[PDB]
mmCIF file of all heavy atoms in Angstrom:
data_model
loop_
_atom_site.group_PDB
_atom_site.id
_atom_site.type_symbol
_atom_site.label_atom_id
_atom_site.label_comp_id
_atom_site.label_asym_id
_atom_site.label_seq_id
_atom_site.Cartn_x
_atom_site.Cartn_y
_atom_site.Cartn_z
ATOM 1 N N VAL B 24 12.924 6.073 28.134
ATOM 2 C CA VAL B 24 11.908 7.092 28.029
ATOM 3 C C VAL B 24 10.669 6.531 28.772
ATOM 4 O O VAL B 24 9.685 7.262 28.937
ATOM 5 C CB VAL B 24 11.390 7.465 26.620
ATOM 6 C CG1 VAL B 24 12.471 8.077 25.738
ATOM 7 C CG2 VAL B 24 10.821 6.228 25.944
ATOM 8 N N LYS B 25 10.722 5.270 29.175
ATOM 9 C CA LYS B 25 9.547 4.684 29.809
ATOM 10 C C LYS B 25 9.054 5.392 31.056
ATOM 11 O O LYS B 25 7.851 5.661 31.064
ATOM 12 C CB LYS B 25 9.845 3.253 30.243
ATOM 13 C CG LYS B 25 8.696 2.522 30.878
ATOM 14 C CD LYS B 25 9.150 1.095 31.143
ATOM 15 C CE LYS B 25 9.116 0.704 32.611
ATOM 16 N NZ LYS B 25 8.983 -0.778 32.797
ATOM 17 N N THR B 26 9.914 5.662 32.035
ATOM 18 C CA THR B 26 9.434 6.295 33.266
ATOM 19 C C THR B 26 8.794 7.669 33.126
ATOM 20 O O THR B 26 7.814 7.968 33.821
ATOM 21 C CB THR B 26 10.488 6.246 34.389
ATOM 22 O OG1 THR B 26 11.736 6.838 34.020
ATOM 23 C CG2 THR B 26 10.909 4.820 34.737
ATOM 24 N N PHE B 27 9.275 8.531 32.244
ATOM 25 C CA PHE B 27 8.795 9.859 31.965
ATOM 26 C C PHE B 27 7.340 9.776 31.480
ATOM 27 O O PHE B 27 6.433 10.503 31.948
ATOM 28 C CB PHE B 27 9.723 10.541 30.953
ATOM 29 C CG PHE B 27 9.205 11.904 30.606
ATOM 30 C CD1 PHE B 27 9.439 12.988 31.410
ATOM 31 C CD2 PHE B 27 8.410 12.123 29.511
ATOM 32 C CE1 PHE B 27 8.912 14.233 31.112
ATOM 33 C CE2 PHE B 27 7.872 13.361 29.168
ATOM 34 C CZ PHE B 27 8.134 14.431 29.996
ATOM 35 N N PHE B 28 7.093 8.891 30.504
ATOM 36 C CA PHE B 28 5.778 8.653 29.902
ATOM 37 C C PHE B 28 4.819 7.902 30.823
ATOM 38 O O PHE B 28 3.643 8.297 30.861
ATOM 39 C CB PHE B 28 5.844 8.011 28.513
ATOM 40 C CG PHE B 28 6.470 9.055 27.621
ATOM 41 C CD1 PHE B 28 7.761 8.910 27.140
ATOM 42 C CD2 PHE B 28 5.720 10.172 27.300
ATOM 43 C CE1 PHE B 28 8.249 9.928 26.326
ATOM 44 C CE2 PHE B 28 6.206 11.194 26.499
ATOM 45 C CZ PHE B 28 7.487 11.033 25.996
ATOM 46 N N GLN B 29 5.262 6.897 31.544
ATOM 47 C CA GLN B 29 4.415 6.237 32.509
ATOM 48 C C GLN B 29 3.967 7.210 33.606
ATOM 49 O O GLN B 29 2.870 7.095 34.190
ATOM 50 C CB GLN B 29 5.211 5.183 33.251
ATOM 51 C CG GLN B 29 5.469 3.884 32.520
ATOM 52 C CD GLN B 29 6.077 2.946 33.558
ATOM 53 O OE1 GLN B 29 5.983 1.729 33.369
ATOM 54 N NE2 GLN B 29 6.668 3.508 34.615
ATOM 55 N N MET B 30 4.802 8.189 33.966
ATOM 56 C CA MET B 30 4.411 9.143 34.995
ATOM 57 C C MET B 30 3.384 10.115 34.454
ATOM 58 O O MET B 30 2.406 10.476 35.117
ATOM 59 C CB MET B 30 5.599 10.016 35.375
ATOM 60 C CG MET B 30 6.431 9.477 36.533
ATOM 61 S SD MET B 30 7.625 10.749 37.057
ATOM 62 C CE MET B 30 9.167 10.103 36.390
ATOM 63 N N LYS B 31 3.605 10.582 33.226
ATOM 64 C CA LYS B 31 2.703 11.522 32.594
ATOM 65 C C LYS B 31 1.364 10.896 32.203
ATOM 66 O O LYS B 31 0.409 11.665 32.083
ATOM 67 C CB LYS B 31 3.265 12.168 31.321
ATOM 68 C CG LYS B 31 4.528 13.001 31.381
ATOM 69 C CD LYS B 31 4.378 14.125 32.384
ATOM 70 C CE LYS B 31 4.728 15.463 31.753
ATOM 71 N NZ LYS B 31 3.861 15.791 30.574
ATOM 72 N N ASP B 32 1.284 9.596 31.906
ATOM 73 C CA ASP B 32 -0.010 9.029 31.520
ATOM 74 C C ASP B 32 -0.726 8.709 32.847
ATOM 75 O O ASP B 32 -0.280 7.907 33.660
ATOM 76 C CB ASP B 32 0.253 7.742 30.784
ATOM 77 C CG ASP B 32 -0.948 6.912 30.368
ATOM 78 O OD1 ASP B 32 -2.065 7.434 30.434
ATOM 79 O OD2 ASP B 32 -0.713 5.788 29.888
ATOM 80 N N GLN B 33 -1.853 9.386 33.062
ATOM 81 C CA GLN B 33 -2.515 9.104 34.344
ATOM 82 C C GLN B 33 -3.815 8.343 34.125
ATOM 83 O O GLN B 33 -4.672 8.411 35.034
ATOM 84 C CB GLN B 33 -2.886 10.421 35.017
ATOM 85 C CG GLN B 33 -1.768 11.334 35.463
ATOM 86 C CD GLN B 33 -1.445 11.129 36.950
ATOM 87 O OE1 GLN B 33 -1.395 12.180 37.621
ATOM 88 N NE2 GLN B 33 -1.295 9.845 37.323
ATOM 89 N N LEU B 34 -3.984 7.713 32.975
ATOM 90 C CA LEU B 34 -5.196 6.954 32.644
ATOM 91 C C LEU B 34 -4.957 5.455 32.703
ATOM 92 O O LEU B 34 -3.845 5.003 32.432
ATOM 93 C CB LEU B 34 -5.708 7.283 31.251
ATOM 94 C CG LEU B 34 -6.055 8.732 30.930
ATOM 95 C CD1 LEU B 34 -6.602 8.860 29.518
ATOM 96 C CD2 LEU B 34 -7.162 9.241 31.834
ATOM 97 N N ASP B 35 -5.994 4.662 33.019
ATOM 98 C CA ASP B 35 -5.723 3.232 33.078
ATOM 99 C C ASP B 35 -6.329 2.506 31.913
ATOM 100 O O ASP B 35 -6.227 1.279 31.896
ATOM 101 C CB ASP B 35 -6.139 2.668 34.417
ATOM 102 C CG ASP B 35 -7.646 2.693 34.631
ATOM 103 O OD1 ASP B 35 -8.477 3.260 33.897
ATOM 104 O OD2 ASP B 35 -8.003 2.035 35.628
ATOM 105 N N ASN B 36 -6.896 3.199 30.927
ATOM 106 C CA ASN B 36 -7.440 2.434 29.807
ATOM 107 C C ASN B 36 -6.320 2.031 28.842
ATOM 108 O O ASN B 36 -5.264 2.637 28.942
ATOM 109 C CB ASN B 36 -8.541 3.157 29.073
ATOM 110 C CG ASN B 36 -8.107 4.564 28.731
ATOM 111 O OD1 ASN B 36 -7.746 4.757 27.557
ATOM 112 N ND2 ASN B 36 -8.221 5.383 29.774
ATOM 113 N N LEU B 37 -6.593 1.011 28.041
ATOM 114 C CA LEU B 37 -5.618 0.514 27.079
ATOM 115 C C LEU B 37 -5.908 1.052 25.698
ATOM 116 O O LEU B 37 -7.026 0.864 25.182
ATOM 117 C CB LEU B 37 -5.803 -1.017 27.032
ATOM 118 C CG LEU B 37 -4.886 -1.785 26.039
ATOM 119 C CD1 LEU B 37 -3.411 -1.808 26.392
ATOM 120 C CD2 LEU B 37 -5.311 -3.235 25.981
ATOM 121 N N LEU B 38 -4.912 1.665 25.062
ATOM 122 C CA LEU B 38 -5.116 2.164 23.706
ATOM 123 C C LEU B 38 -4.785 1.118 22.663
ATOM 124 O O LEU B 38 -5.565 0.861 21.736
ATOM 125 C CB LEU B 38 -4.082 3.276 23.508
ATOM 126 C CG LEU B 38 -4.292 4.450 22.576
ATOM 127 C CD1 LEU B 38 -2.939 4.895 22.036
ATOM 128 C CD2 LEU B 38 -5.416 4.278 21.608
ATOM 129 N N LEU B 39 -3.658 0.386 22.778
ATOM 130 C CA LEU B 39 -3.409 -0.632 21.740
ATOM 131 C C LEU B 39 -4.118 -1.933 22.028
ATOM 132 O O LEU B 39 -3.590 -2.884 22.607
ATOM 133 C CB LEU B 39 -1.899 -0.875 21.771
ATOM 134 C CG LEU B 39 -0.944 0.312 21.568
ATOM 135 C CD1 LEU B 39 0.515 -0.113 21.493
ATOM 136 C CD2 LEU B 39 -1.215 1.014 20.245
ATOM 137 N N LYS B 40 -5.393 -2.018 21.650
ATOM 138 C CA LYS B 40 -6.163 -3.227 21.942
ATOM 139 C C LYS B 40 -5.602 -4.465 21.276
ATOM 140 O O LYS B 40 -4.998 -4.395 20.204
ATOM 141 C CB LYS B 40 -7.535 -3.070 21.281
ATOM 142 C CG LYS B 40 -8.314 -1.904 21.829
ATOM 143 C CD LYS B 40 -8.483 -1.958 23.341
ATOM 144 C CE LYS B 40 -9.476 -0.835 23.734
ATOM 145 N NZ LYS B 40 -9.531 -0.841 25.234
ATOM 146 N N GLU B 41 -5.920 -5.618 21.777
ATOM 147 C CA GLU B 41 -5.433 -6.882 21.224
ATOM 148 C C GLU B 41 -5.919 -7.211 19.831
ATOM 149 O O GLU B 41 -5.418 -8.077 19.133
ATOM 150 C CB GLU B 41 -5.760 -7.992 22.239
ATOM 151 C CG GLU B 41 -4.922 -9.255 22.027
ATOM 152 C CD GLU B 41 -5.862 -10.214 21.297
ATOM 153 O OE1 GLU B 41 -6.990 -9.720 21.073
ATOM 154 O OE2 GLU B 41 -5.512 -11.366 20.980
#
Side-chain angles (χ1 to χ4, degrees):
Chain B
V24 296
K25 182 176 119 155
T26 56
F27 178 82
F28 293 109
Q29 283 189 157
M30 269 190 255
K31 299 304 232 59
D32 176 13
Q33 295 264 230
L34 302 182
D35 67 351
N36 50 102
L37 179 68
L38 208 211
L39 303 186
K40 298 305 189 185
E41 199 259 1

